[PDB]
Design a protein around this nucleic acid. Structure first.
Lengths: 83, 149, 71, 149, 83, 71
DNA sequence: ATGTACGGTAATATCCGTACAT
DNA sequence: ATGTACGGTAATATCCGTACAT
């Protein structure tokens, strides 16, 4: 609404972007800014983990149900933590 | 050597502290401060009482079940090995565990991009995930509660 | 290089700019080199993903024309 | 009683032919002709030599692996039972099988919305699918080739 | 490009449609016509079967590999077909 | 009933009209009763699907604020 | 009442021009 | 060369008006 982005590009690049925008029933404005801020979230937030896997999800759930006892190295590190 | 969260004051500095991996040093020297200031992550640094010899980053996440993620952890080459790295992992676990007492978090994930790091986190008790999650290791909040009795 | 220039001018909210420019700097590239690269890869994706749709329509109408008469 | 594909000429008529199910009769009387004319489906009718006592519809599909789908099949109440229904299924199989000889089709699916139809298609050799495909039954083109030696 | 669709609706309906269009970064033109022709394909083409299921897909593949012999009823129907 | 009217006027290709009006008649409803119902259900979907995104952002920033200090 | 339908003027937003910088 | 940047006039496309129908 209030800010703007200005860039320059090849007529080949513009032809490709415009063709795909038309295929998407979109202006190059909305195509560019969508394909930008939609792909930019993929960068600025790695705050999601899709563990979905028959073994991985079951490992996580077994950890939640049966919590592994803290190992020797973790206990020694906790001892080294106080200071 | 003490561990403390990054201070929002300007001119903090503490330039170079080589850990061996150029990517982690680059992240420390050109991404960490701004991403902490912009609330993208929470950055903790291990340094002396004069003002850096290590750092780690924490970030809230969801697996949805809420958790916390340790994305980056680096230790200077003058502090060779896992020792202070494991101590920083314990510090991060204590932080995540107080945060779970506060708002509720069920676990902590950790990013391991190479086999040395994979074995390092495996020696600390993290459970190896497989498939598309091969680079991610998990540790429950119950085990962290067990660590601090 | 081998190519020239031709501009595009779009308008956003500054809160959307922030999220764009941050990911641009995190990928070590200018706002232009980000926006344009992302738009171009998206554009190639939905330019081949439409070609496969057209292929599907063609083969469907082939099976449909063969579901009619013996010839 | 003969089976033939719908003729694109106007004024075909053949109004009412109750099969028991109001939905199939409604589709025959208000959707079939236009969808055949518009190439959405291929409609085949079983009627006498004077100009309807049954119908079925075929439609190309993909499971991608290409196939053909029998969505609707209806037989008048004056022709009680499965007999001419099974004969129409055989006619549709022959059509699909010539079409496979022409352009390549690996199977025929069939839509069964009630248990009576499910058992009917199961008595003809269609394999029952499960899950989200519970209403769909399948028969391979190899079995249709076996049917016509 | 060359045709048009004209309809009338409630101000409540219009408020909802406009809100969701704004959330989608779209005009009510593109939102309406997309959400229309995107959902209309779901009606005018039941030409796809997503068998994906551990049992259903394996049944189909076993049919393709091992083709079931034509049953008695199918043979009698084939005999009744010639005429 | 209980409600009034307020129009919307959009323009398409006749080949897209065909596909819209056909599905409208197949669902036994006018072009208006089709277009509007489909748009409204889509609109409710992407109006609750955004509410869940806002909820996720809120709880994420809660976990983030608790990942800072002890208080 | 509402579905279908045509077009003219308000609104928009796509373009250039113009700027200094690398 | 190209990234960043501001705004003014061309373009668009959003609105009403107007029509007859249910």
């Amino acid at each position: 609404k209030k800010q703007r982005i200005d860039l320059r590009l090849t007529d080949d690049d513009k032809s490709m972007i415009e063709e795909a925008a038309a295929i998407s029933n979109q202006s190059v404005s909305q195509f560019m800014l969508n394909s930008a801020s939609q792909r930019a979230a993929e960068v600025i937030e790695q705050h999601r983990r899709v563990i979905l896997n028959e073994e991985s999800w079951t490992r996580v759930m077994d950890a939640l149900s049966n919590p592994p006892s803290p190992g020797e190295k973790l206990k020694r590190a906790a001892k080294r933590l106080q200071g | 050597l003490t561990i403390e969260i990054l201070t929002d004051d300007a001119d903090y500095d503490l330039q170079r502290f080589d850990c061996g991996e150029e990517a982690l040093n680059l992240f420390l020297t050109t991404h960490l401060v701004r991403q902490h200031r912009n609330k993208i992550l929470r950055a903790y640094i291990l340094c002396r009482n004069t003002p850096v010899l290590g750092y780690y980053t924490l970030c809230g996440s969801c697996f949805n079940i809420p958790s916390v993620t340790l994305g980056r952890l680096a230790i200077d080459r003058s502090l060779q090995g896992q020792g202070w790295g494991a101590t920083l992992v314990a510090h991060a676990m204590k932080v995540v565990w107080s945060a779970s007492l506060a708002v509720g978090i069920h676990g902590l994930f950790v990013e391991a991009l190479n086999e040395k790091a994979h074995t390092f986190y495996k020696s600390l008790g993290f459970i190896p995930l497989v498939g598309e999650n091969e680079n991610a290791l998990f540790f429950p909040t119950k085990s962290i509660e067990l660590l601090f009795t």
